[PDB]
Amino acid sequence: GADDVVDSSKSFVMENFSSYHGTKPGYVDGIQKPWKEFYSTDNKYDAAGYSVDNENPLSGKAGGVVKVTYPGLTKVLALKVDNAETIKKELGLSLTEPLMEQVGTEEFIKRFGDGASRVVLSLPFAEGSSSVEYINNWEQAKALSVELEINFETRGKRGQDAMYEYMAQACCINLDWDVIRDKTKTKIESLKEHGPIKNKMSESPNKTVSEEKAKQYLEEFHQTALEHPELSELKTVTGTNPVFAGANYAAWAVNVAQVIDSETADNLEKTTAALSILPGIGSVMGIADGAVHHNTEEIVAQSIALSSLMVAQAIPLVGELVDIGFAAYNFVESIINLFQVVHNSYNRPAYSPGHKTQPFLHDGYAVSWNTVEDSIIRTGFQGESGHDIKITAENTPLPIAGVLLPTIPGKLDVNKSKTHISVNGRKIRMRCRAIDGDVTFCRPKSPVYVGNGVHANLHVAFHRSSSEKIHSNEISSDSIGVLGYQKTVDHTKVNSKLSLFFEIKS
């Protein structure tokens, strides 16, 4: 009955029920459908995650957050599961028409409304989160009044700075990114005017050389720069952890120079996509052993300045770019974004690192099925299923490029709206495309890193279009392929891959 699917401990009627909604750029200049449902949440800071430009999700401008209020009485109906078939079954609804259309009917409101004008559904927001998500009917949502909470397009704020500084209120790392940006330019100029740095630059081959020669030179560049008095703070931190050594630092800058071509360099979104899948970012960001070591505006600016100049030096040696301009422009802008992402994770409670089944370990990552049942993909019914996978990493921030998922035409499709990754409770949706008729690749809409203290739940959601059973000879994929960082070996690109094998059953 109702009781198997409604959580009565979280259900109630409120007058002037209010929640938060993240708005896309341009909106701030009521509520109207552009998603077959209007989503809101009790958490103004997580709302900020619905707000980035759908066309440039990693790097593009964030819009804002509004508070939306229904006048009169609203029933909040908390659900114990998010499976549409189960809900329709046990609430005794039509098993055919969409759940959210039915939720908007006179009859549903009378049956479940408890005297309210409308019903909103409530679900848990994500693994690792204590937030609530509300699901609203579009037509009903037209009654909402709307008040501005924050506009991230506010003049004077440069990147996604306004969004991340707002989100940092949740918390703690609370840096002024305007100060960092100003200080970064200042530090670059100081390094460029420094006699020893000028001397070191003139020692550059300044032409294509071996990766070994490049690294040797860049290591010396790193050491010379750390002796500048304006990098004294970064010098002190650098000596406290082997992650921050010149050799590791040099290795980041080489890898950057190797992957940035001119098409990439001239686009911030592409630059951010490329940088976000590289290993070894903890060496530059000062992150190791479960803590942010580069934790002031001074140290951050000093490391970004130095990495900028080191990328500039690396490009002639191992890169394919004619200009050095990338190093000062899109490189800095993109890396600032990555710092903000990782800080945001470290400002949140660590999702449990405890694998519930024996983990598979590879390349510093560990992955496991949440439960046996998660590893089973059932067949021979129409409808949805959800499957949880825990992802940790041992030490520095390691990226998750995305996930490779099986598909079978009309028997197993990825539900692109419910599939997501939650990093310390930050819920990040996915963009998914077919590699072919058998495999879909899903990439996070914000950069994902895991590391010590930053752990994730990957939630894969499938939809079945028909009631016929998947046949043994239809199974291309034995596994879900989680994709980690990309390494450039010879000149070829290899992704870290961690596979979890599943079983098809009736």
Residue 230: which of 313, 310, 309, 298 has the closest Cα?
Answer: 298
221, 248: one domain: yes
Residue 58: which of 281, 435, 306, 337 has the closest Cα?
Answer: 337
User: Which among 320, 350, 380 is the end of a domain?
Assistant: 350
d(CA 66, CA 82): 25
d(CA 317, CA 439): 38
338, 357: one domain: no
- β-strand partners of 371: none
| Whole-angstrom Cα Rg for the chain | 25
| Residues with a known catalytic role | 133
Please name the helix (run of DSSP H) or strand (run of DSSP E) that holds residue 448, with its range, or none.
none
d(CA 491, CA 220): 25
* Residue 93: alpha-carbon gap to chain centroid: 36
The 10 Å CB-count burial string (b at 16+, else e) for 81-93 is ebbbebbbebbeb
Q: Which amino acid is at 478?
A: D
Q: Which residues contact 113 (CB under 8 A, 6 or more apart)?
A: 75, 119
Q: Structure solved using which method?
A: X-ray
Count structural domains, the chain.
3
| The residue count for the chain | 506
User: Which among 125, 148, 171 is the end of a domain?
Assistant: 171
Contact 160, 52 (CB under 8 A): yes
Q: Which amino acid is at 74?
A: T
Q: Which residue has the tokens 């034995």?
A: 478
Q: Strands (DSSP E) along 303-450, which ranges?
A: 360-362, 365-369, 376-378, 383-393, 398-399, 402-406, 413-414, 420-423, 426-434, 439-444, 449-450
Contact 205, 217 (CB under 8 A): yes
Give the domain range for residue 312: 172-350
Distances (CA, A) of 285 to 112, 288, 312, 319, 357: 51, 9, 18, 22, 32
User: Which among 350, 371, 394 is the end of a domain?
Assistant: 350
Burial bucket for residue 495 (CB in 10 Å: 0-12, 13-18, 19+): middle
Distances (CA, A) of 379 to 45, 154, 463: 38, 50, 10
Distances (CA, A) of 360 to 121, 137, 461: 37, 42, 21
Residue 288: which of 343, 351, 241, 345 has the closest Cα?
Answer: 241
Distances (CA, A) of 136 to 68, 69, 125: 11, 12, 14
139, 253: one domain: no
d(CA 446, CA 22): 15
Contact 406, 500 (CB under 8 A): no
For the chain, percent helix, then strand, then coil, each to nearest 5? 35, 30, 40
Q: Give the largest Cα separation in the chain, rounded.
A: 80
233, 254: one domain: yes
